[PDB]
Write a protein that binds this ligand. Structure first.
Ligand SMILES: [Mg+2]
Ligand SMILES: [Mg+2]
Ligand SMILES: [Mg+2]
Ligand SMILES: [Mg+2]
Ligand SMILES: [Mg+2]
Ligand SMILES: [Mg+2]
Ligand SMILES: [Mg+2]
Ligand SMILES: [Mg+2]
Ligand SMILES: [Mg+2]
Ligand SMILES: [Mg+2]
Ligand SMILES: [Mg+2]
Ligand SMILES: [Mg+2]
Ligand SMILES: [Mg+2]
Ligand SMILES: [Mg+2]
Ligand SMILES: [Mg+2]
Ligand SMILES: [Mg+2]
Ligand SMILES: [Mg+2]
Ligand SMILES: [Mg+2]
Ligand SMILES: [Mg+2]
Ligand SMILES: [Mg+2]
Ligand SMILES: [Mg+2]
Ligand SMILES: [Mg+2]
Ligand SMILES: [Mg+2]
Ligand SMILES: [Mg+2]
Ligand SMILES: [Mg+2]
Ligand SMILES: [Mg+2]
Ligand SMILES: [Mg+2]
Ligand SMILES: [Mg+2]
Ligand SMILES: [Mg+2]
Ligand SMILES: [Mg+2]
Ligand SMILES: [Mg+2]
Ligand SMILES: [Mg+2]
Ligand SMILES: [Mg+2]
Ligand SMILES: [Mg+2]
Ligand SMILES: [Mg+2]
Ligand SMILES: [Mg+2]
Ligand SMILES: [Mg+2]
Ligand SMILES: [Mg+2]
Ligand SMILES: [Mg+2]
Ligand SMILES: [Mg+2]
Ligand SMILES: [Mg+2]
Ligand SMILES: [Mg+2]
Ligand SMILES: [Mg+2]
Ligand SMILES: [Mg+2]
Ligand SMILES: [Mg+2]
Ligand SMILES: [Mg+2]
Ligand SMILES: [Mg+2]
Ligand SMILES: [Mg+2]
Ligand SMILES: [Zn+2]
Lengths: 50, 86, 244, 135, 53
RNA sequence: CGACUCUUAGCGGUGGAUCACUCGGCUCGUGCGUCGAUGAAGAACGCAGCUAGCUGCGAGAAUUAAUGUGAAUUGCAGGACACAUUGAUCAUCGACACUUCGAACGCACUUGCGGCCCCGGGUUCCUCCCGGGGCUACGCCUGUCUGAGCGUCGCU
RNA sequence: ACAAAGCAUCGCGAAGGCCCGCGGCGGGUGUUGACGCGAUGUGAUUUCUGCCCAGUGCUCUGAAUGUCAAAGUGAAGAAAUUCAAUGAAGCGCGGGUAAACGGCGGGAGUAACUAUGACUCUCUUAAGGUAGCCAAAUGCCUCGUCAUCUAAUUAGUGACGCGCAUGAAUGGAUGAACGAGAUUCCCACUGUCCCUACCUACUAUCCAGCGAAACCACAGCCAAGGGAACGGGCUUGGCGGAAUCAGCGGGGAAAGAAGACCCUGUUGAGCUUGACUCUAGUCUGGCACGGUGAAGAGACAUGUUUUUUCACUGACCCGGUGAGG
RNA sequence: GGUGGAGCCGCCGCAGGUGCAGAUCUUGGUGGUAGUAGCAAAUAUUCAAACGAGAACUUUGAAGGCCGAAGUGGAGAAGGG
RNA sequence: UACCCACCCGACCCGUCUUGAAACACGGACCAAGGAGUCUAACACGUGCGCGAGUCGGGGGCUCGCACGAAAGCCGCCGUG
RNA sequence: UAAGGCUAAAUACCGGCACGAGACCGAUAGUCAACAAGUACCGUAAGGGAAAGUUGAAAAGAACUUUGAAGAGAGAGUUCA
RNA sequence: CGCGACCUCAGAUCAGACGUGGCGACCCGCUGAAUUUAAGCAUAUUAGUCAGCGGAGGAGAAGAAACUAACCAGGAUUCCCUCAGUAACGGCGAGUGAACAGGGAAGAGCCCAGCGCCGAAUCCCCGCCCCGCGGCGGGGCGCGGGACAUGUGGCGUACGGAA
């Protein structure tokens, strides 16, 4: 928006750190069922919850 | 022109983030939430969509106080005492 | 089936009166010693005109005879009032244009406007743009007076209440034809949303009781009971005659 | 009396429930005063009420309220039953003198509904198939 | 639709029975909740007619 | 024997049926029957050496002390520890702690404005200014103080 | 089509008109006051606006001997009660009103060709269509009749008018300017046409690359016959040669949509009113809050009741102000 | 017979959510159509070099061109994050 | 008998509503898995069994923490009904 | 004997804490959810709302040689497979 | 034109407390339909049900007769079997539809006001000490307050009670 509130900026701060992939050693822990993040977002498709 | 042409002049928003719900439900013109009902003192639950009711009731959050109230009772609700030292 | 326009002028909220730029109520300076015994003074400041009214208003400056200050009013200007004139008020005032008196004092046939229907209500009757009210005859005891209004009806009024002398300024506003639909929209755009009025015969029978038909005809007598329910009560309301 | 609040005559449905004007309220006017009295002062506990005077348009009831947590009530027995949390808002559940009369209970051939606990638990016991384990 | 010499059979299921059906699978466990009380009360008032006054 | 087409079979794909499992449900019993202005339910934002999600937690933040337990934790590091040590870890949990919203509470929801007290710097209360702590919501009870009334009087 | 200026009616002096609201001493018009507000009708200008108040409305200081409830009063009974008198609004009765809804007819004879009929007879009604206008966007018969325009015209324009079924603010007649409004004719123009031709760009076409969908019982050459009364298959004939490319619109009663028509259903909705049953609202009476003082009167009785009228101000109501004489 | 890698059936009785071709059935899968329809709105590309396993499509140079300042140019609002 | 092929004769595509369907009537590309007369109560008749002018069965009661038990057994309760 | 008041026990519990069981279902079944499920995702919003279990016993999860730009292969090896 | 009682009534960031919200299976007040059934439908029915709203508890409500009965009489409430799909309701149609007694589970009863008696015999909050303190209390001492005579405490409440 470039004219943001503070609550709005925090919301984007959290959604922008959830985006990264899974650390590759996680795939090594004992009881795993996780391969790819599957909870990623891409600003062109699935716009934010706004 | 009621579609694909009017779906274009849609810049401004009716709802935003409610400070009590956390949902993108707060009506800005009306200044009430509309999922809990914000300036009203009581939450808008309903006996009238049980599926929406069980989406946010006790247990669906953290219960970060209630979850230890069940712990104390189970043992006796005592306080101001410490187990016997070594 | 629907709720007919005219039923809707009550809820307001669109059919509501358009009053941002209006200069303020056109009142008549409530009473005290000065009105009830003496003849308080005051001078005219200006003749500013308000939107939505054909009569010009006048900011008349008295000075409050109790605290050092300057009360300012808005009188519906009598025709002849000019800037700088001295307007005198009260019981002991003398009878000339722009002086407010109690109708009990002035003789019969006097031509007054901005009259009060009950004592003290600060001016209610005969104040439109070119109207006046003639005083008819007195009645010393029972303190009442008979007064003819612009409608031609005659009303018995208590002799106490006051009224400025003269006629309301701006006479003949109805004489020049509006002459184009623009000047009408442009005219009510200062009063309220009652314009272009659609005749009922053009609406479908769900919107207005005079509707429907394979010709644009009314269908039932256009005169209607005064004891009607809201929604039927449309057309000639409780007409006693009907025709030129 | 009462006036059925529908946004005109406008009671949709069969002409039996068509009524708006003439119907009356189930509770009494006294049990409305006790309610409004204890609804204001949520700390205090309604005890009982009587009549004082009336108008064509008003009825003045007057209500005895008690502070459940003042030591002149907590310590003296025979009045500490109001402290126990069972009695919060007696007049909201219809437990005062006036409120109970609307519930229509008593003993005898007159009060046959409400022969369980109350008018609701009456038929809760009649409209129940008692499907036994053994039939 | 009646057929050929039955009864008239006004059965009361028009209202809504499925909701307020009370099954009795407590029945044998209630026999036991009461039995302990019946015993626990007799042991509590030891010399006394267990049946009551 | 040309290719194509069809049927069948051998194998190979495509697909996920069947089958065998199951830290999950459903149903029925039993015991208990445990919220919140000392601030709940719910929501937000944070917190791991490498950590996104679930979970666990609250600037003392993948836990704190304590008590049992008694040598791990682990994907890789990395480590203290002396495993003759509250002693690694887990369980319990009764000591302590509890970011921001929220009945939410100084007024407002921008995250903005204040007031009143105190204690640091500033001052040498000199007022700001800067920093820090405690109050300041509505309703109502009992008491307390200050009052108002040509209300009833009394004394003057 | 609507709107529109304009014309016109209609209610209303504020405890008002219209109107909202579930409810308040609530709100809109209203920061208003008849040159204002609300409710309709027609639709500039010009020229006009004819008859009808019987019908349905509306309305009227209108008689309410018509009826008519709750209470109220009266009488019999032992009492539930029963029977009396009386009587509000609206209904019944009587006025007004058509720029309210709306209405505005049928027969014979009679003039010097014939015809037509000024003229004269009945009948009916509430008046019986006046000024105008017409085969018009209104005329069934209908390609009405005459003229004009054409070589030729169910078209157009102009006249004619017993007009199935025109016509006066449900407005009549006109009409400059204006119109992406409807027609007709003429000049100019033209590949609209006689009658087609060629040229250009992008396609389609072939190739590399990439690659869908609707649809599909099985399928796909015909004649005739029968047949659920129009076959691809069946009977009898005709015949049949792999795998395909560009086209093509005869056939698959091709696809697309449990037909929008029609009929049924004891299935609905939207709207209407002289359907049935009700309702908000409003008019009127009773009872309650509801008092004080004054006169006076009738009816019954030999006090009661009805109370009519004029005052009062403490409830109640509205008005104003910074509650200032 | 084969592959498959952990459980299973016969008889006497009892109990069922018990047998599918079909419901424009539900869910999933896969064909024929078909390597087909298609990748045709705004005139336009070409040469050389570089990089590279690999160049009609990147990058640099050169040439031809269009947008033509009511822009395909230079900056903002809301919206996006 | 079942795989392929050959021949002679026979032979129209199933489901459905229908007086009548191969129908120029409708559903159906194909294949997997899912998928529709159930339970409760109340009658009625038939049938099997116990007892028989009687016969129960429920609710209670007496016997368990059930492993099998929330079973089985027993009770002037057994007749209050 | 009304117009005032208090009261344990048998009685009810598809929420909660903590358990136990089953002629129940067995991954299109059983709760929507055996998994990061009221999650992903849609809708402005009220709300809507999925799919998705199984290597082996132990990762012993294919070192090395080789072809290829690389994806993929050929040998080799691990394994009861 | 003052000072003083009391009665009304205000203001306190005054001393001390307390109420709101959540859950909502069961529970208690109120509100309250329409699909549906009747082969149509309007009464009826669905149904005092769904939704709406308020309020609680570990259970709630109810509860010690203004009862039942007609008997040689029973004896608070709640639940189960029964009464019984019966008495009654109903376009007497569709349909609706209790109770009493009897058996059993359980079993518990009690307080006021008033009328009176008693020197207000009473209660609250302060201040000092003694004990106790993680459900704030007891004991004593104070011309420390205040409530209360417009009525607190003891006996007493209909089964009778007081004297
Ligand atoms: Mg986008
Ligand atoms: Mg129309
Ligand atoms: Mg209408
Ligand atoms: Mg017993
Ligand atoms: Mg093969
Ligand atoms: Mg295979
Ligand atoms: Mg699957
Ligand atoms: Mg005073
Ligand atoms: Mg008109
Ligand atoms: Mg006329
Ligand atoms: Mg008339
Ligand atoms: Mg004529
Ligand atoms: Mg003409
Ligand atoms: Mg022509
Ligand atoms: Mg003509
Ligand atoms: Mg082609
Ligand atoms: Mg065709
Ligand atoms: Mg029929
Ligand atoms: Mg209908
Ligand atoms: Mg009628
Ligand atoms: Mg295995
Ligand atoms: Mg099964
Ligand atoms: Mg199957
Ligand atoms: Mg150009
Ligand atoms: Mg730029
Ligand atoms: Mg047929
Ligand atoms: Mg055919
Ligand atoms: Mg069909
Ligand atoms: Mg009692
Ligand atoms: Mg699966
Ligand atoms: Mg499977
Ligand atoms: Mg599943
Ligand atoms: Mg698998
Ligand atoms: Mg599998
Ligand atoms: Mg193997
Ligand atoms: Mg609450
Ligand atoms: Mg029906
Ligand atoms: Mg039917
Ligand atoms: Mg029907
Ligand atoms: Mg009904
Ligand atoms: Mg009912
Ligand atoms: Mg409910
Ligand atoms: Mg209780
Ligand atoms: Mg009670
Ligand atoms: Mg009893
Ligand atoms: Mg029987
Ligand atoms: Mg009923
Ligand atoms: Mg006493
Ligand atoms: Zn909210």
């Amino acid at each position: 928006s470039s004219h943001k509130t503070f609550r709005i900026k925090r919301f984007l701060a959290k959604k922008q750190k959830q985006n990264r992939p899974i650390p590759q050693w996680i795939r090594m822990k004992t009881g795993n069922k996780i391969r790819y993040n599957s909870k990623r977002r891409h600003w062109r498709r699935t716009k934010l919850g706004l | 022109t009621k579609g694909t042409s009017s779906f274009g002049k849609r810049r401004n928003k009716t709802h935003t983030l409610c400070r009590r719900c956390g949902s993108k439900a707060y009506h800005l013109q009306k200044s009430t939430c509309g999922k809990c009902g914000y300036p009203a003192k009581r939450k808008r639950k309903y006996n009238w969509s049980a599926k929406a009711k069980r989406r946010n009731t006790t247990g669906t959050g953290r219960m970060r106080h209630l979850k230890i109230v069940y712990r104390r009772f189970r043992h006796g609700f005592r306080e101001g005492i410490t187990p016997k030292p070594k | 089936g629907r709720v007919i326009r005219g039923q809707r002028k009550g809820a307001g909220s669109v059919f509501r009166a358009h009053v941002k730029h209006r200069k303020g109520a056109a009142r008549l300076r409530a009473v005290d010693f000065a009105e009830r015994h003496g003849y308080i003074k005051g001078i005219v400041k200006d003749i500013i005109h308000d939107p939505g009214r054909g009569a010009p208003l006048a900011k008349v400056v008295f000075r409050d005879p109790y605290r050092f200050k300057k009360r300012t009013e808005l009188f519906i200007a009598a025709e002849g009032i000019h800037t700088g004139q001295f307007v005198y008020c009260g019981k002991k005032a003398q009878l000339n244009i722009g002086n407010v008196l109690p109708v009990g004092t002035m003789p019969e046939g006097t031509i007054v406007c901005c009259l009060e229907e009950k004592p003290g209500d600060r001016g209610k009757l005969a104040r439109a743009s070119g109207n006046y009210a003639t005083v008819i005859s007195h009645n010393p005891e029972t303190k009442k007076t008979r007064v003819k209004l612009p409608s031609g009806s005659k009303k018995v009024i208590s002799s106490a209440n006051r009224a400025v002398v003269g006629v309301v300024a701006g006479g003949g506003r109805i004489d020049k034809p509006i002459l184009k639909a623009g000047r009408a929209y442009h005219k009510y755009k200062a009063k309220r949303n009652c314009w272009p009025r659609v005749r009922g015969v053009a609406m479908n029978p769900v919107e207005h009781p005079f509707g429907g038909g394979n010709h644009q005809h009314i269908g039932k007598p256009s005169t209607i009971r005064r004891d009607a329910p809201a929604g039927r009560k449309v057309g000639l309301i409780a007409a006693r005659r009907t025709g030129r | 009396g009462r006036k059925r609040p529908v946004p005109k005559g406008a009671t949709y449905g069969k002409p039996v429930h068509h009524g708006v004007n003439q119907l009356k309220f189930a509770r009494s006017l006294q049990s409305v005063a006790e309610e409004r009295a204890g609804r204001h002062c949520g700390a205090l506990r309604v005890l009982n009420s009587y009549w004082v005077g009336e108008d064509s348009t008003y009825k003045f009831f007057e209500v005895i309220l008690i502070d459940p947590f003042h030591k002149a009530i907590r310590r003296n027995p025979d009045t500490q039953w109001i402290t126990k949390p069972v009695h919060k808002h007696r007049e909201m559940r219809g437990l005062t003198s006036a409120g109970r009369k609307s519930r229509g209970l008593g003993k005898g051939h007159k009060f046959h509904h409400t022969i369980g606990g109350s008018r609701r638990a009456a038929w809760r016991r009649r409209n129940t198939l008692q499907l036994h384990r053994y039939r | 639709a009646p057929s050929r010499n039955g009864m008239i059979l006004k059965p009361h299921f028009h209202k809504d029975w499925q909701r307020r059906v009370a099954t009795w699978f407590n029945q044998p466990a209630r026999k036991i909740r009461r039995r302990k009380a019946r015993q626990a009360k007799a042991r509590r008032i030891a010399p006394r007619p267990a049946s009551g006054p």
